[model samples]
Target: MNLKLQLKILSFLQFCLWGSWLTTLGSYMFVTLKFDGASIGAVYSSLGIAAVFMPALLGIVADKWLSAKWVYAICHTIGAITLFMAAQVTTPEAMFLVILINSFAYMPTLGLINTISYYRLQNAGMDIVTDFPPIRIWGTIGFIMAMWVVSLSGFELSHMQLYIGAALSAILVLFTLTLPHIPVAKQQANQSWTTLLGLDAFALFKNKRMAIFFIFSMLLGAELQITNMFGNTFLHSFDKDPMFASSFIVQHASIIMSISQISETLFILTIPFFLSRYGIKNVMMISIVAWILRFALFAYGDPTPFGTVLLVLSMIVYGCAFDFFNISGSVFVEKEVSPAIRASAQGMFLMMTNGFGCILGGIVSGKVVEMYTQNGITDWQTVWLIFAGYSVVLAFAFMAMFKYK
Candidate 1:
């Protein structure tokens, strides 16, 4: 097969592993396992914890020792095992540790996939900017497809979702072998200790603009995971209300929320134009507003007609809230950094957004949800409204504080 097809397949399967469990895992914890918000939220932080450190650590290993494809395969293989074990865990503590290990094995491959794709594309004479997004969009398609599969198969709230993840992950192990063999870089000597350990990337923090950009990246990252953690559960919660008890959305919350993934694919296509026309800050400002609306819409939405419209609007805006910041932020980073540390800078960006961002989103949002719950039932409207307020403040803070040309 051609390089583009291979990359596309990689992208699709890469996300399929995540989509199987990400959207519905909260419902599994809440309804099936009967865990509290804080417990599940804390459990969710494992993704971020692994995100902060794993990419950089594994990047070093891939660069110095094994080929990128091999590293990718090994991680996914181990991930498959951990995910299978994770399905069997009953206690929150066991669940956390198992998933955390799975995360350590899984998260780093996100970077590895990109690294391999870029190298192979360049080798095949394709322009990454022109070709990569089309391939990457398939990942969203894969995500939505997996979400549909799990929900439609009645596995959304079952341990079977994790098993599905494990099965797909194991498939990737064989697929990785088919990918172009991405060789390790040639070894060089006399590197400084920091450089040797890949700490040289930390110097990006010295740049005022880059530093400010990453700090907000962390904040935006925090916002990114909030809905994924709660959206399905929020919709499913409506089943408890007599009025919304029989609604289509409440019955198939995952498919309804899949609209966000669809919207995400659409918004990604608009980003280049938005970036060119409005510049990064304005594009990001648009995303901030989208985030605000994303939450505000959810605050007022229910399974009823007008409420359903509001929820659909929320899902649609999520595309803007997610794509603009992440894609534009990466573009901005690419233009701002020197080649020597570009990979490191990107890793740092992931660290701030996914690592610290994941932590903040999981823990703080958990507390907020817990605060608004009584007798094990949550007040989702108040929870969503508070998040909307948080987004509004974040938008103002970004505008007032950041200065760029």
Candidate 2:
């Protein structure tokens, strides 16, 4: 297979493994398993817990002892097993433990896939800024397709979504074996433990501007968690109302939510231009405002014809809300850091965004949702408004504190 084509497939399968379950799992837990909001949030927090250290830890292993491809394969092997196990568990605590183990196995592969792709792309003399997004967009495409498959197949609310993820994960393990090998970095005798373990990236915090960036990254990361953990559930909630009971939005909420990933495919292509022309500060500001719109739209959107437009528009804004910060932040970090610690620096970015941010989002959003629930009915409008208000605060804070020419 051609290298770029191969990388695209790798990206596709990587997210497909996630897409099979990530979006729909909330609905599964809510409607099928009868798990409470707090329980579901606790379960999703496993991603945050594993992300806090696993990516960096595995990055060190890939750096010193194992080939990146081998590490990738090993992670997926564990992921496949746990994903299969997740389907078998019934209780909230049992599901949490199962998914937590799966999260530890799955999260690190996110960074590993990037490591392998960047190494190969550079080796092939391709320009990462210009070429990588085109390849990465396939991951969004794969995510959308997987969501559609699960939704259309009636597996969105079933454990069969876990089965779909496990089967894809098993396939990914075999696929990783065929990828070109990434050699381990040559170890140096004088290297400190912090450097060896990728903890040195934490030292970036000593700089004021970098500190602000990272802190906000962590904050915005929580927003990502808020949507992922509840967006489908919010859509599915409409089924309880007779007016929306037969609506397409209620029937195929995953497909409607998949529009966000589809929007991601388009917005990702704009990053290079936006980052180059607008700079990271402005691009990030766009992301913050987009986040505000994303939540506010959801607040007012419903099954009514005009309201459905808002729902679709919110999904469209999600691409800007997500891609601008995530892709642009990665690019910004690449330019801001030195070569020796660059990989670790990227790992630090992942730590802040997916790690601490997810933890905060999961715990707090769960509480907020629970507070708003009365007799099994949630006041979703107020919940979305609160989220939108949070984004407004973030936007003002970013504008006031973050400085860039």
Candidate 3:
């Protein structure tokens, strides 16, 4: 296969691994395992726990010693083994520990994928600015396809999601082993202490403007986990309403959630325009509005085709609500931070979303779900209302704090 297609296949499955089950795993934990909110949140927290230092540790090694492809392949191999082990675990705590190991291997690759792509495109004399987006769009497509496959196969409601992830991880591990080798990234000899992956990004918060951005990013990051945790499950819960009893969504939550990934395919193309013309801060505000729509629509919609419309809108809005802030936020960091510290700065942006933000969301949202969802008749309306309140508060606070241009 040609290089472009080869890279596209790899990128596609990378997301497919997560997309196949991420949206509905909370339901699996709650409905199947009978895990309590704290236990479930703690389980979810394992990813953030792994994210704490694993990315930096892996990145440092990849930068100084190993070929990026080999490093990438080894990570995938470890992830596959951990995923397979997670599937066989008999208890939630044991499963959490196993998934943590999987995450240790898996989460860092989220960063590694971009690094590989960046260097590969550069080495091929292609402009990442222009050529990479087209290649990267395939990843979203792959993710959406994986979700559809799960839903269509009726695996959305089964522990089969775990099996599917394990099987796919194995495929990804083997596929990665044969891909073109990426040169090891080398650090400069005169790099400053701050450029080394410590808390140097914390220095950005010394400026009021950047500080406001980071805080708001943390708040919005909470929404990231909330929707990822409950969205498909929320739809599936419609089955209890009787009106939704026979709906396809009640039957296939993951496939319905895949619409978000489909939306990502289109929404990504809009990024450069918004980021270049309006800039990251405005783009973030636009994303906040999108998040409001995302939750509020789910509040009102039900389980038929009308529910599909709301869900699809939620999905479409997700691409903007999520990608706009995340991708644009990284661009803002690249623009503002020193080149010597760029990689580390980008890592900090991730920490905000996947690290601190994830911990907050997992713990808080799990509590909310436990509080409202316990009576055998879920108070979904109130649940959504509480979430909408959060988005509104965050948006208002962000607008007041940041000087948006």
**C-alpha local distance difference test of each model:** 0.83, 0.83, 0.74
lDDT of 3 by residue, 1-405 (tens): 676777788899898887776776767776676666556777787877777776576657554666667777888888777767766665778878987888888877876777677777767677889878777877777777878888898777667877788778788878877666654543224343224556656776676766676767777787676777777667778777677778887877776776676676678788888888997769878877887888888787677667678877887787788888778667776667778767766767767775878878887877787788776445667777788788888888877766565
lDDT of 1 by residue, 90-187 (tens): 88888889989988888878767877887899777889899988898889889989999999998978999999999999988888888765445532
lDDT accuracy of residue 381 in candidate 1: 92
Under the 3 Å rule for N, CA and C atoms, how many clashes does model 1 have? Answer: 0
lDDT score for residue 220 of model 2:
76
User: How many Å off is the CA of 229 in candidate 1?
Assistant: 1.2
> Global lDDT for candidate 3?
0.74
Candidate 2, overall lDDT?
0.83
Q: Write the per-residue lDDT of candidate 2 for residues 51-122, one digit (tens) a residue.
A: 776756665664466666887898899999999998988898998898888888788777677778877887
Tell me the lDDT of model 2 at 364.
82
- Could you say which candidate leads in lDDT? 1
Candidate 3's displacement at residue 345, Å, is 5.3
Off by over 4 Å in 1: 1-7, 118-134, 178-197, 207-213, 327-347, 403-405
Q: Please list the residue runs of candidate 3 whose C-alpha ends up more than 4 Å from where it truly belongs after superposition.
A: 115-131, 181-196, 275-281, 305-307, 327-347, 403-405
